[PDB]
Design a protein around this ligand. Sequence first.
Ligand SMILES: [K+]
Ligand SMILES: [Mg+2]
Ligand SMILES: [Mg+2]
Ligand SMILES: [Mg+2]
Ligand SMILES: [Mg+2]
Ligand SMILES: [Mg+2]
Ligand SMILES: [Mg+2]
Ligand SMILES: [Mg+2]
Ligand SMILES: [Mg+2]
Ligand SMILES: [Mg+2]
Ligand SMILES: [Mg+2]
Ligand SMILES: [Mg+2]
Ligand SMILES: [Mg+2]
Ligand SMILES: [Mg+2]
Ligand SMILES: [Mg+2]
Ligand SMILES: [Mg+2]
Ligand SMILES: [Mg+2]
Ligand SMILES: [Mg+2]
Ligand SMILES: [Mg+2]
Ligand SMILES: [Mg+2]
Ligand SMILES: [Mg+2]
Ligand SMILES: [Mg+2]
Ligand SMILES: [Mg+2]
Ligand SMILES: [Mg+2]
Ligand SMILES: [Mg+2]
Ligand SMILES: [Mg+2]
Ligand SMILES: [Mg+2]
Ligand SMILES: [Mg+2]
Ligand SMILES: [Mg+2]
Ligand SMILES: [Mg+2]
Ligand SMILES: [Mg+2]
Lengths: 48, 127, 197, 106, 61, 172
Amino acid sequence: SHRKYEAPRHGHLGFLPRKRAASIRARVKAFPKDDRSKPVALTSFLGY
Amino acid sequence: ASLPHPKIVKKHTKKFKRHHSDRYHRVAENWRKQKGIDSVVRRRFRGNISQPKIGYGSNKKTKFLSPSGHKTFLVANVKDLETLTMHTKTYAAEIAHNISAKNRVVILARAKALGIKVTNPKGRLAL
Amino acid sequence: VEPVVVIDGKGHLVGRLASVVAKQLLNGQKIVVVRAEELNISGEFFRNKLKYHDFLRKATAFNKTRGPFHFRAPSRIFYKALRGMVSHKTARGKAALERLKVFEGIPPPYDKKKRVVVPQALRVLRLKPGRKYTTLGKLSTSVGWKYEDVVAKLEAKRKVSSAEYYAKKRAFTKKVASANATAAESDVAKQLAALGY
Amino acid sequence: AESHRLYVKGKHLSYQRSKRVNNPNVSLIKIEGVATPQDAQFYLGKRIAYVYRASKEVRGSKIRVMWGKVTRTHGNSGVVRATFRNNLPAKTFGASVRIFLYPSNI
Amino acid sequence: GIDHTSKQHKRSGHRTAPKSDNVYLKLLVKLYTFLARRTDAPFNKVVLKALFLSKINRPPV
Amino acid sequence: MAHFKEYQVIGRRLPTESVPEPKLFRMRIFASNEVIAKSRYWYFLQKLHKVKKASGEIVSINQINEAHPTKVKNFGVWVRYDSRSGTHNMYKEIRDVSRVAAVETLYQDMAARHRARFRSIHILKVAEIEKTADVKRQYVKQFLTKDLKFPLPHRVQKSTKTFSYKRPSTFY
RNA sequence: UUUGCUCCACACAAUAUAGAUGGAUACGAAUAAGGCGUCCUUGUGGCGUCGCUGAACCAUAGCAGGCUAGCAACGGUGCACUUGGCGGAAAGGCCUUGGGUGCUUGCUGGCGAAUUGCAAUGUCAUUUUGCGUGGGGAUAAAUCAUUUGUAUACGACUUAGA
RNA sequence: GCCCUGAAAAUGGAUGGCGCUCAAGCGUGUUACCUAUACUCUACCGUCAGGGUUGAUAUGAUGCCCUGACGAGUAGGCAGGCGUGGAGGUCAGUGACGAAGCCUAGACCGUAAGGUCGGGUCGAACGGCCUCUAGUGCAGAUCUUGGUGGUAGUAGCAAAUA
RNA sequence: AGAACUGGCGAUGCGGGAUGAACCGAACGUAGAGUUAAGGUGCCGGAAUACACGCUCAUCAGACACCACAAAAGGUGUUAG
RNA sequence: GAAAUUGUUGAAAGGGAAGGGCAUUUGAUCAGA
Ligand SMILES: [K+]
Ligand SMILES: [Mg+2]
Ligand SMILES: [Mg+2]
Ligand SMILES: [Mg+2]
Ligand SMILES: [Mg+2]
Ligand SMILES: [Mg+2]
Ligand SMILES: [Mg+2]
Ligand SMILES: [Mg+2]
Ligand SMILES: [Mg+2]
Ligand SMILES: [Mg+2]
Ligand SMILES: [Mg+2]
Ligand SMILES: [Mg+2]
Ligand SMILES: [Mg+2]
Ligand SMILES: [Mg+2]
Ligand SMILES: [Mg+2]
Ligand SMILES: [Mg+2]
Ligand SMILES: [Mg+2]
Ligand SMILES: [Mg+2]
Ligand SMILES: [Mg+2]
Ligand SMILES: [Mg+2]
Ligand SMILES: [Mg+2]
Ligand SMILES: [Mg+2]
Ligand SMILES: [Mg+2]
Ligand SMILES: [Mg+2]
Ligand SMILES: [Mg+2]
Ligand SMILES: [Mg+2]
Ligand SMILES: [Mg+2]
Ligand SMILES: [Mg+2]
Ligand SMILES: [Mg+2]
Ligand SMILES: [Mg+2]
Ligand SMILES: [Mg+2]
């Protein structure tokens, strides 16, 4: 039978699996769309 | 050489092994007929072991014949062996398992003298 | 009749092509299908999109990574049709499937090889004129295939190169045809014509 | 010449079978260039060899042969039935066979 | 399949030999078997049949 | 039932002492063979007159061949058929070179368009429409115009081989 | 490394084969339209022609293809060199220059073949591995242990240490 | 008629699946083709039935032979056989030169119950045939007794301050 | 849930209906060859992507009896009357 | 000095059991003539 009182689910299923990352340095999975009129520049940087 | 015979046809060469003798050690391979009410083997469902039946009976002309065309006759001594003196083409002597080595020598010598084929001449030979 | 048969999948009625190809692999023929993005399916694009969405909703409820995998690329859609028509869970079916390769576009191994068609699967020969049909590339893009633009670009490049190759071949063929037209009234040519050649 | 072949190529398709039971004692052979049973009648009775290779040399060769013959036509599309002295192994479904031109009636 | 109108493998239901192991009775049966086969005498046939009868089927006379 | 023949079937309603020489009724039956033809004769005769096969006899049965089998005719065909919910008379027109060919076409068309099986159809009449402009169906009239020509666009050639090397053409 | 590793050539041993037995022979697009040829006023052009399947095209003769003698022509083809160019979608292939060598069945001769006995796949392919003979090439790391806490139940992770 | 609206249910899913649109759909017609332990023919096994043959070298008339038909099976009936402990008879049977037992992806016979042989192990008895006899055949009974596993190097061996 | 007749299942495998006690076909000694039944012949899958005349386009098409459902009422959809 | 169960050695196979039937390939092994 139905849940008897509605409530949002706990947590975000889009951040699955809740596993350890494969590296200590997180991957950049997307860079800014290239605009080939601007001067050549890095799209990101590394820091601590 | 033995008496000429038709080609020996074995209708079912493979052993009729009891159902589930491959599954349980307590179930020996000696054939037993399933009597169970639901038995898939007794009911002869496709894909199951075949059961012994009289249709598998061998041609009476070739029944009991060894591949050499001789019927095996077990012999314990020379007198047993010479029971086959006039039947060398139909019977071959097989020396009994419990015959000692010296008696085997004597039986083999008599069989060679009489032209009687011996199925197991290499039993208990001098090493 | 060849060690490998390369089928140009363009306009080829995915189901009928899959039937032909499945029988070919099971009979032991190596098949390479190219231009799977240009395959056709009978019925409106909306119909086939709805069918693929019905496919998409099917998934193992307790773990979607166990469920049926919904491959988006046109080559993998065609492969799904072929696999569904091959007994793929047996070693024989596995061997048949290893006798198969399917590609979007015509990659470098096969762009310089002869492509054949399958008339019993050709859309223009099979479908009644006026019947609406879907193109696999459009359907695949709509359901999440990411490489329609890249495949189209590489296909345009290949077509430029292949048109240059064909211009050269046409010139050489005209030369050979002229040289055969000359010495066609020779005694040898008359004897050949008498024998049917 | 570059060609030495005196046999017609064929493919071992399957055993004789119904939907769910096969009969290994009969093989089905697709002969190259035969599209009708009328054409296959020519090849009825011809000897067929399945030629394969083994690691162990037996009687001066590492090539072994399974001999059979075409017995009758099968279906409408030129497939024939074949019987071999020993039935074909069924891993050879899709493997090549050689249908020789003998016994010749030409 | 055959639609049998009668029981299959039905024994005749008549004795073909005496149940007795009496060697002399068997000798009489052998003699009258020969006679019933090679004389066409209904007497010989009925005597052969009577030689097979059990004790209650041979009441004293 | 099959490729049809046409038979004349003449039956008698067997003579008695009171009524010798009974009235010799004849029918034209479309059937694939004489057995079906006689069965159909008795069916329709039982629909029309007090008779049955047990009380009557087939006096004759003769195949009627088309008088001019190689001339194209327009046929008016009156049929009576049972639908799923009633019985209906319909008139159709068929262009063909013989009555048997027209009747085969008619049975095919009835099965195709009204799902009427052979058992549900009675052929009331098949008649040649001698004068055009007595043809009253457009799907036949359109073939009776002067100098009728028409192309056959999109020709599909049946390949004898699995693979073709040509990317075929539908020109005609 | 009680002479290790890698590449090439050769030879010898194994190893198997989802199954060679002349050639997978490359436009693109349309199909109620096209292909090819040709011409011009270069086009959605004119004219001619083709399809109606690859039933094609190419190849194909020679002890499984030997040894030789010529003719004709400067063709065809194999090999290893070599000139240069193109090819990144999985390029790993395509094209091209020059000379050298072999073959050439385009044509005409001379010699050989047998006895595998009337057939027997009658062994001619390529896949990996090993070994030996030569030549060529290069001269590390990882883990355990110790250590860190950006990590951690244990493994794992992340650090440091000649 | 077909198609459509009417036409809403709970895990994701079923013309069996793929897929199929002048169908690989629906109605209808025609052929070819595929394949059951069914039908036809043949062999072999058995059963039943009808017969032939005691005229000899003939020891197996319960034998040999001829002819025809037939063969599903729970509960159940009957028949013919296989195996075990012991008993009378017999083979003047086997055996310390190795009985019995046991092990043996070694061989042979039987449709089968089983039988026989070889090899190893072993150490004192045992078997064939005709009969007699029964405390005579096990997969089960939450069977009985004994023995042994997987679980599993697992749960855990943490109260009473050290 | 309860009767009538017959045929079955139980007691029965085999080919077909994917699957299934009962449906269809057919009942069964061991084999060989031939031919079929019911059911099928795109591919899975043995067997015509056979031939023929039509019909149907469904943004929930339909796809063989038992059987695994759909109705009244409607539609210048389209077809034939 | 059996079996269950186990160690070692050798042989073989092994994509969510294993085992079985028919048939043949391959390896091993073997009788008969
Ligand atoms: K066991
Ligand atoms: Mg709620
Ligand atoms: Mg046996
Ligand atoms: Mg039961
Ligand atoms: Mg995604
Ligand atoms: Mg029978
Ligand atoms: Mg509906
Ligand atoms: Mg089908
Ligand atoms: Mg139809
Ligand atoms: Mg008798
Ligand atoms: Mg019985
Ligand atoms: Mg006792
Ligand atoms: Mg001993
Ligand atoms: Mg063992
Ligand atoms: Mg002692
Ligand atoms: Mg007891
Ligand atoms: Mg027990
Ligand atoms: Mg029990
Ligand atoms: Mg217990
Ligand atoms: Mg216990
Ligand atoms: Mg613990
Ligand atoms: Mg505790
Ligand atoms: Mg404490
Ligand atoms: Mg009961
Ligand atoms: Mg039944
Ligand atoms: Mg069903
Ligand atoms: Mg049979
Ligand atoms: Mg097939
Ligand atoms: Mg309605
Ligand atoms: Mg001890
Ligand atoms: Mg043990």
